[PDB]
Design an enzyme around this catalytic site. Sequence first.
Site, PDB file in Angstrom:
ATOM      1  N   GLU A  62       0.852  -1.220   0.000  1.00 34.04           N
ATOM      2  CA  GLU A  62       0.000   0.000   0.000  1.00 34.04           C
ATOM      3  C   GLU A  62       0.870   1.245   0.000  1.00 34.04           C
ATOM      4  O   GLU A  62       0.630   2.183  -0.773  1.00 34.04           O
ATOM      5  CB  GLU A  62      -1.046   0.021   1.151  1.00 34.04           C
ATOM      6  N   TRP A  84      -8.371  -2.104  -0.773  1.00 31.32           N
ATOM      7  CA  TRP A  84      -9.113  -1.028  -1.422  1.00 31.32           C
ATOM      8  C   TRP A  84     -10.125  -1.512  -2.494  1.00 31.32           C
ATOM      9  O   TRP A  84     -10.873  -0.735  -3.009  1.00 31.32           O
ATOM     10  CB  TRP A  84      -8.150  -0.027  -2.056  1.00 31.32           C
ATOM     11  N   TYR A 110      -5.201   9.450  -1.545  1.00 33.17           N
ATOM     12  CA  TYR A 110      -3.835   9.572  -1.077  1.00 33.17           C
ATOM     13  C   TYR A 110      -2.719   9.771  -2.090  1.00 33.17           C
ATOM     14  O   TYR A 110      -2.028  10.702  -1.999  1.00 33.17           O
ATOM     15  CB  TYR A 110      -3.438   8.406  -0.150  1.00 33.17           C
ATOM     16  N   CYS A 170      -8.655   9.015   6.028  1.00 31.24           N
ATOM     17  CA  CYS A 170      -8.537   8.878   7.464  1.00 31.24           C
ATOM     18  C   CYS A 170      -7.282   9.562   7.981  1.00 31.24           C
ATOM     19  O   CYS A 170      -7.295  10.101   9.015  1.00 31.24           O
ATOM     20  CB  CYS A 170      -8.437   7.440   7.873  1.00 31.24           C
ATOM     21  N   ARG A 190      -8.023  11.063  11.700  1.00 34.16           N
ATOM     22  CA  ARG A 190      -9.340  11.565  12.118  1.00 34.16           C
ATOM     23  C   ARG A 190     -10.235  10.498  12.736  1.00 34.16           C
ATOM     24  O   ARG A 190     -11.176  10.827  13.471  1.00 34.16           O
ATOM     25  CB  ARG A 190     -10.075  12.225  10.954  1.00 34.16           C
ATOM     26  N   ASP A 193     -10.173   2.787  13.723  1.00 26.64           N
ATOM     27  CA  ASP A 193     -10.709   1.474  14.089  1.00 26.64           C
ATOM     28  C   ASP A 193      -9.616   0.802  14.845  1.00 26.64           C
ATOM     29  O   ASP A 193      -8.660   0.301  14.258  1.00 26.64           O
ATOM     30  CB  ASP A 193     -11.136   0.696  12.814  1.00 26.64           C
TER      31      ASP A 193
HETATM   32  C1  LIG Z   1      -5.918   0.105   6.365  1.00 30.23           C
HETATM   33  N1  LIG Z   1      -7.049  -0.739   6.087  1.00 30.23           N
HETATM   34  C2  LIG Z   1      -8.299  -0.018   5.848  1.00 30.23           C
HETATM   35  C3  LIG Z   1      -9.354  -0.165   6.913  1.00 30.23           C
HETATM   36  C4  LIG Z   1      -9.081  -0.557   8.250  1.00 30.23           C
HETATM   37  N2  LIG Z   1     -10.068  -0.669   9.147  1.00 30.23           N
HETATM   38  C5  LIG Z   1     -11.382  -0.419   8.788  1.00 30.23           C
HETATM   39  N3  LIG Z   1     -12.423  -0.556   9.638  1.00 30.23           N
HETATM   40  C6  LIG Z   1     -13.677  -0.270   9.155  1.00 30.23           C
HETATM   41  N4  LIG Z   1     -14.848  -0.348   9.993  1.00 30.23           N
HETATM   42  N5  LIG Z   1     -13.931   0.161   7.881  1.00 30.23           N
HETATM   43  C7  LIG Z   1     -12.915   0.264   7.047  1.00 30.23           C
HETATM   44  N6  LIG Z   1     -13.085   0.649   5.737  1.00 30.23           N
HETATM   45  C8  LIG Z   1     -11.635  -0.020   7.461  1.00 30.23           C
HETATM   46  N7  LIG Z   1     -10.639   0.127   6.580  1.00 30.23           N
HETATM   47  C9  LIG Z   1      -7.039  -2.170   6.167  1.00 30.23           C
HETATM   48  C10 LIG Z   1      -5.965  -2.867   6.598  1.00 30.23           C
HETATM   49  C11 LIG Z   1      -5.980  -4.253   6.724  1.00 30.23           C
HETATM   50  C12 LIG Z   1      -7.048  -4.983   6.322  1.00 30.23           C
HETATM   51  C13 LIG Z   1      -7.191  -6.439   6.555  1.00 30.23           C
HETATM   52  O1  LIG Z   1      -8.021  -6.504   7.458  1.00 30.23           O
HETATM   53  N8  LIG Z   1      -6.692  -7.863   6.328  1.00 30.23           N
HETATM   54  C14 LIG Z   1      -5.806  -8.567   5.417  1.00 30.23           C
HETATM   55  C15 LIG Z   1      -5.079  -9.739   6.091  1.00 30.23           C
HETATM   56  C16 LIG Z   1      -4.521 -10.990   5.366  1.00 30.23           C
HETATM   57  C17 LIG Z   1      -3.353 -11.821   6.023  1.00 30.23           C
HETATM   58  O2  LIG Z   1      -2.560 -11.273   6.964  1.00 30.23           O
HETATM   59  O3  LIG Z   1      -3.085 -13.057   5.730  1.00 30.23           O
HETATM   60  C18 LIG Z   1      -6.884  -8.946   4.504  1.00 30.23           C
HETATM   61  O4  LIG Z   1      -7.492 -10.063   4.696  1.00 30.23           O
HETATM   62  O5  LIG Z   1      -7.295  -8.054   3.570  1.00 30.23           O
HETATM   63  C19 LIG Z   1      -8.185  -4.286   5.960  1.00 30.23           C
HETATM   64  C20 LIG Z   1      -8.182  -2.943   5.848  1.00 30.23           C
HETATM   65  O1  LIG Z   2      -6.577   3.356   7.156  1.00 34.01           O
HETATM   66  C1  LIG Z   2      -7.650   3.340   7.709  1.00 34.01           C
HETATM   67  C2  LIG Z   2      -8.895   3.477   6.954  1.00 34.01           C
HETATM   68  C3  LIG Z   2     -10.121   3.455   7.753  1.00 34.01           C
HETATM   69  N1  LIG Z   2     -10.102   3.247   9.184  1.00 34.01           N
HETATM   70  C4  LIG Z   2     -11.382   3.232   9.845  1.00 34.01           C
HETATM   71  C5  LIG Z   2     -12.012   4.097  10.902  1.00 34.01           C
HETATM   72  C6  LIG Z   2     -13.443   3.796  10.797  1.00 34.01           C
HETATM   73  O2  LIG Z   2     -13.783   2.683  11.623  1.00 34.01           O
HETATM   74  C7  LIG Z   2     -13.609   3.406   9.384  1.00 34.01           C
HETATM   75  C8  LIG Z   2     -13.817   4.604   8.519  1.00 34.01           C
HETATM   76  O3  LIG Z   2     -15.087   5.177   8.599  1.00 34.01           O
HETATM   77  P1  LIG Z   2     -15.393   6.721   8.615  1.00 34.01           P
HETATM   78  O4  LIG Z   2     -14.512   7.295   9.743  1.00 34.01           O
HETATM   79  O5  LIG Z   2     -15.076   7.517   7.394  1.00 34.01           O
HETATM   80  O6  LIG Z   2     -16.819   6.758   9.099  1.00 34.01           O
HETATM   81  O7  LIG Z   2     -12.411   2.681   9.042  1.00 34.01           O
HETATM   82  C9  LIG Z   2      -8.898   3.098   9.985  1.00 34.01           C
HETATM   83  O8  LIG Z   2      -8.845   2.957  11.245  1.00 34.01           O
HETATM   84  N2  LIG Z   2      -7.701   3.154   9.129  1.00 34.01           N
END
Ligand SMILES: CN(Cc1cnc2nc(N)nc(N)c2n1)c1ccc(C(=O)N[C@@H](CCC(=O)O)C(=O)O)cc1
Ligand SMILES: O=c1ccn([C@H]2C[C@H](O)[C@@H](COP(=O)(O)O)O2)c(=O)[nH]1
Lengths: 288, 288
Positions: A62, A84, A110, A170, A190, A193
Site C-alpha cells: 500500500e 481497497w 492519497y 482517514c 481523524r 478502528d
Molecule cells: C488500512 N485498512 C483499511 C481499513 C481498516 N479498518 C477499517 N475498519 C472499518 N470499519 N472500515 C474500514 N473501511 C476499514 N478500513 C485495512 C488494513 C488491513 C485490512 C485487513 O483486514 N486484512 C488482510 C489480512 C490478510 C493476512 O494477513 O493473511 C486482509 O485479509 O485483507 C483491511 C483494511
Molecule cells: O486506514 C484506515 C482506513 C479506515 N479506518 C477506519 C475508521 C473507521 O472505523 C472506518 C472509517 O469510517 P469513517 O470514519 O469515514 O466513518 O475505518 C482506519 O482505522 N484506518
Amino acid sequence: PPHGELQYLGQIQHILRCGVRKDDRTGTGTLSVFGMQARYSLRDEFPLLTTKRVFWKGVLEELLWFIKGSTNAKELSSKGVKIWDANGSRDFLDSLGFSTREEGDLGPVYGFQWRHFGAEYRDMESDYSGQGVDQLQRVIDTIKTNPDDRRIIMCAWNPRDLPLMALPPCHALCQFYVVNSELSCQLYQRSGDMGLGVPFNIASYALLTYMIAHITGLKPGDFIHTLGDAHIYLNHIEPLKIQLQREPRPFPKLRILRKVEKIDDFKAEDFQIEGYNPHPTIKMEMAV
Amino acid sequence: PPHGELQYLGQIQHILRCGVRKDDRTGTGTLSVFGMQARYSLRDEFPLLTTKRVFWKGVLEELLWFIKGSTNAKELSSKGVKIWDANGSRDFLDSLGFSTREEGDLGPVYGFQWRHFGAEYRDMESDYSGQGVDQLQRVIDTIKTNPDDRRIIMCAWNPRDLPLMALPPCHALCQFYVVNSELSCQLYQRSGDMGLGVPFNIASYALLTYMIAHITGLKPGDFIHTLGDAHIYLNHIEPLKIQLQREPRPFPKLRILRKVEKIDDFKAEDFQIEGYNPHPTIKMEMAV
Ligand SMILES: CN(Cc1cnc2nc(N)nc(N)c2n1)c1ccc(C(=O)N[C@@H](CCC(=O)O)C(=O)O)cc1
Ligand SMILES: O=c1ccn([C@H]2C[C@H](O)[C@@H](COP(=O)(O)O)O2)c(=O)[nH]1
Ligand SMILES: CN(Cc1cnc2nc(N)nc(N)c2n1)c1ccc(C(=O)N[C@@H](CCC(=O)O)C(=O)O)cc1
Ligand SMILES: O=c1ccn([C@H]2C[C@H](O)[C@@H](COP(=O)(O)O)O2)c(=O)[nH]1
C-alpha cells in the site's frame, strides 16, 4: 513508563474503561474516545505489533502504491493486497454517483494528493507529471535543506476534491520534525478502528518515516500517533480482551537492504522485517 | 479534579526539563518537544488562562474576522487588534517578493480557506461569494444532520495556496465530534510558541466550539489541543519560570447574551467573559 506496544494496549484499555457508546454509519456501534495520542520509538526497533500478527505485506505494498501516486485499486490488488478493492467496485462507485467512472478508480485519494495536490483530477490512468504540488518530494527537500522547519507537512485532506474521492482520507495529514539528526513523524488520524485499522496504520507511517530517514541520511526518531474518533467496534470487544491477555514480544527490526537515493526507487524487496515473532491473528469482522 | 490549566503548565515544565535545543529562523533558539496533547473541559467553564492574562479582545475580534472570511489585516487592526499588522506591512510583503500586493493583503489565509477553500485568490477586496468550499458552514450542517460523522473537518492547510500566504497557517486543521449532546473540538497546531501563542490559541478554538455548539443546540464538551513542534523561545525561559510559581485561579465562564441563528450573525457584544481573575501579564519578547 509504558513504551512501545504498551501504548497501543493502554489505549485499548482506556477506551474499554472510559469510551462512550457511539453509533456509526454501519449500525455496528462503538465505544469511542475523542482525542488520543501515543508515542512509538523508532530507534533500533520497528513498531509492528506482536500481540496479534499485522498484515505487513499489505502495509508495504500500500505504501509503495501511495508513493507512486496511484489511485487505481486494481494496481494494488495485483500485488495480492485487496484492502481497497471493495471501494473501487462498480457497485460502490455507482452508490456514490460515479456511474461514468471505471472500476478501480478511487478518485483523487492519497496517491494523488501526496504527489499532485491541487491538480485537476481526470481518471486513474491520466498523466499528472508536473501537475499540482508534489508534497512528498517537497517534504524530503525541506528536511535536507532546512531541517529546523516547523511546516514540514504532507496533507491528504483536500476539501475541494473530497466529493470525488471514494472515501474521505482517514490520515488527514502528517508532519515531520528533525532534531539531533533524528527524524520524527506525527500523524493526524481523524478516525481510528482500533482493532482492525490502527495497528496497520502505525506500521505504515513508521515505514514512511524509515524511508524518508534513509533518503535524507537521518536516524528514525519517534512516531507520534494522534487520533480523532478513537473507537472499538462492539464486536471487537471480546477479541481485544483476548489480545490484552497476551504478553508482548520485543518489536522486530526493519532493515533496508541497499542504498536508495530517491523515494520513488524503493521496491518491496528492499525491505526486511527481522525477528518478528507475533502471537496469532485474531479474527475481527470489519464493519464496512 | 485538577484545574485544567495545570495541563498547560505541565507542558511548560516538560519542555523545560526534556525539551531539546532547536534553532529557528530568528536566531533566538528554542527548547522543543515534538508531539503533545492536552484536554480542556468546556463544561460550565471556559479555558482562558489565569497564570498570565490572555488577550481576550484579540481572541474574539480575530475569530469574528476569520468567520467573515477576511484576509485584510487593516480590517482587524481597525478593531484595536494589531496581531497581523506586521505580516501585512509594505516591508514584510516586499520581503516575501509580494511587491505588487496592497498593504494589508495577507493572501489566502484562514478566513479565505475556511469559507472559500479551493477558489482562486485574487486580492483581499475581491468578492468570493459562492466560490470554493465553505468549510465552516458545512461543518455546522453536518453537526446538525449527522452528529455521529467522523469527517467533520475544517482545514486551513492548502498546499496550492501556501506560496501566496503572508504566513503558513499554524492551525492546520480542526475536527469536531458529537456524543451525548456534547460538541468537542480537536486542533492540530503544527507549531506552538508556548509562552506567547498557545494560551491565545486555546481560547480561540474553545470560543469557536462555544459558537458552533450555540448554533447547533449542543453543549460544549472538550477542546483537545494537539501540538506538533511545541517550543519555548530561550528568552522566555525566565519569564515562564516566574509564571510557573503562580497558582491558577478558577476558570471564567463564557456567556452568550442572545439567541443567534447563523454563525455569521455573531457580534463581539454577544459575548461576556464572567469571573476572569488572571495574574498580571509577564513581558515576553516575540521572536523576529
Ligand atoms: C488500512 N485498512 C483499511 C481499513 C481498516 N479498518 C477499517 N475498519 C472499518 N470499519 N472500515 C474500514 N473501511 C476499514 N478500513 C485495512 C488494513 C488491513 C485490512 C485487513 O483486514 N486484512 C488482510 C489480512 C490478510 C493476512 O494477513 O493473511 C486482509 O485479509 O485483507 C483491511 C483494511
Ligand atoms: O486506514 C484506515 C482506513 C479506515 N479506518 C477506519 C475508521 C473507521 O472505523 C472506518 C472509517 O469510517 P469513517 O470514519 O469515514 O466513518 O475505518 C482506519 O482505522 N484506518
Ligand atoms: C496568537 N498570536 C500570534 C502569534 C503568537 N506568538 C508568536 N510567536 C512567534 N515567535 N511568532 C509569531 N508570529 C507569533 N504570532 C498573538 C497573540 C497575542 C499577541 C499580542 O501581542 N497581544 C496584545 C496584548 C494587549 C492587551 O492585553 O490589551 C498586544 O499587545 O498586541 C500577539 C500575537
Ligand atoms: O497562532 C499562532 C501563530 C504563530 N505561533 C507561533 C509558533 C512559532 O513560534 C511562530 C510561527 O513560526 P513558524 O512555525 O511558521 O516557523 O509563531 C503560535 O504559537 N500561534
